Amino acid sequence: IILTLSQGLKKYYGKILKLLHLTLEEDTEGLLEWCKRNLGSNCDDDFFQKRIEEFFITGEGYFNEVLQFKTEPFKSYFAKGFLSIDSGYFSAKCYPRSSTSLINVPARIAETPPKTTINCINLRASVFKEEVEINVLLPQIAVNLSNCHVVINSHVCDYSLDTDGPVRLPRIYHEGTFMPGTYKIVIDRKLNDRCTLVTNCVIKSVLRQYKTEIKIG
Amino acid sequence: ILTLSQGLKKYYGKILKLLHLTLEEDTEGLLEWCKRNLGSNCDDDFFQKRIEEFFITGEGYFNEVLQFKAEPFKSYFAKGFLSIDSGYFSAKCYPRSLINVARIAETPPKTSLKTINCINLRASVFKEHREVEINVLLPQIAVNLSNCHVVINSHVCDYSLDTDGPVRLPRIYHEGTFMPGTYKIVIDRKLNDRCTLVTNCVIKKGQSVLRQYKTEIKI
Ligand SMILES: *[C@@H]1O[C@H](CO)[C@@H](O)[C@H](O)[C@H]1NC(C)=O
Ligand SMILES: *[C@@H]1O[C@H](CO)[C@@H](O)[C@H](O)[C@H]1NC(C)=O
Ligand SMILES: *[C@@H]1O[C@H](CO)[C@@H](O)[C@H](O)[C@H]1NC(C)=O
Ligand SMILES: *[C@@H]1O[C@H](CO)[C@@H](O)[C@H](O)[C@H]1NC(C)=O
């Protein structure tokens, strides 16, 4: 029943990741006693939501691994670059606002007449002979992966995805829903053979929309 | 003739001198290292452009030679930051992946840091361990250290200083002189006993006229 320091931290990280809408499952059993024994405060959804908000926006100086700022085992506050929120089943490298100097979340675009090296206003494809990166500029327009293993980078949180379907982006709640403005999807060509991305390619100052299936390898 | 590592350190030395971070350099044999390894000329124009592309208009990946896009620097396996280390001075410079750079009136204290009432300075003491940070908000107004060893952080480049006098900040040239918008000065109290920082404390509604009085921060 009693949870150790690392186990309680991993459960704390697991719930924070689920509120970020990065994972679809969680394991948060036993977190109430770990908080009231180490943190000393309640760990309800309000506590976490405020912690996520304070971390990604309105950040102030240093913090701790429990994502607490200040203007017993987590009182050292030797963290300002980034924080590695790792629950054991899914890891994420999240960057605080203290490192950055997120949009406030749309419309549906009309249809234009190929669905299968592209020419999209919303997509930027780069090929490094060293991998393939497909940067997107319209994060609300989704890019569903299929039979793929990617790592997506951003200015809010970097992490790797293998679940097929819609890409899960972090979403902060502070007077509304805040989503990143743009994210980049890197794909290792050397296991990713049958990887297919289905997206909506945008053609031009009115914009147009047509589906396309971009496959790598 | 200079080896690969030695040529890189001299390459870093010239970039550091152009950044106005160091006052001395060792660049003898650097042109031969460039035309033999880089394949391009290594004049002040070449370096100035490399500094320009690195700190502004940066786009994606680069190499330790500050080039963006047997050729030992064609793999472009470098992201995040670059450690410009010449052997005599190290600096962790971050690419964008800067202000453009007035006199304030005078007001009538001459010396703790718990209270300095400065609009230009934000003094924090981290009892969280053993360190003192004095954030500055007006980089043009200089803070001269005396008998001190600090490490200054910024959004352009982190490095440590021990030379007494004005703090040396990076300066990028692109249609003008660009300096960082704000820098942080950390001081480890646990060798840094005789440290004295002399700065211009800013005192005194939106209609408030701006004022200035000298102050000597003792640690
Ligand atoms: C975000 O947008 C919503 C739109 O209704 C608005 O109500 C809210 O105040 C905005 N929040 C911020 C922080 O801009
Ligand atoms: C991604 O999947 C969702 C859910 O089925 C779908 O509505 C959307 O159209 C897909 N993406 C594109 C670009 O079609
Ligand atoms: C700085 O001033 C110079 C000289 O007028 C100008 O060319 C340059 O665009 C300015 N840069 C910024 C960022 O204001
Ligand atoms: C620092 O040194 C310069 C040297 O010219 C001097 O003018 C200035 O008054 C000193 N103090 C400050 C706060 O800059």
Author numbering:
A (entry chain A): 257 to 327, 345 to 374, 378 to 381, 385 to 392, 394 to 396, 401 to 414, 417 to 476, 479 to 492, ...
B (entry chain B): 258 to 326, 344 to 371, 378 to 381, 386 to 392, 394 to 396, 398 to 476, 479 to 492, 498 to 512
Quote the authors verbatim.
Crimean-Congo Hemorrhagic Fever Virus (CCHFV), a tick-borne virus from the Nairoviridae family, causes hemorrhagic fever and death in 5–40% of cases. The GPC includes two structural glycoproteins (GN and GC) and secreted glycoprotein 38 (GP38) containing proteins that also can be linked to a mucin-like domain (MLD) and one non-structural protein (Nsm). The role of GP38 in viral replication and pathogenesis is still being elucidated, but GP38 is essential in the maturation of CCHFV particles. Additional studies have observed that GP38 may be secreted or localized to the outside of infected cells and the viral envelope.
One X-ray structure of GP38 from IbAr10200 has been solved, which has given initial insight into its overall fold, but a GP38-antibody complex has yet to be described. As only one structure of GP38 had been previously solved and was from clade III CCHFV IbAr10200, a highly laboratory-passaged strain with little clinical relevance, we solved an additional structure of GP38 from Clade V CCHFV Hoti. This human isolate is one of the two that can be used to elicit human disease-like symptoms in a non-human primate model. In addition, CCHFV Hoti has a 15% sequence identity difference with that of the IbAr10200 isolate that might reveal any major differences in tertiary structures or surface composition between CCHFV GP38s. Crystals of the CCHFV Hoti GP38 were readily obtained, and the structure was solved to a resolution of 3.2 Å. Both the structures of GP38 originating from the IbAr10200 and Hoti strains followed the same global fold. However, an additional alpha helix is detected between Hoti GP38 beta strands 2 and 3 near the N-glycosylation sites. Also, a divergent loop conformation is observed in amino acid region 490–500, and like the IbAr10200 structure no electron density for the amino acid region 330–345.
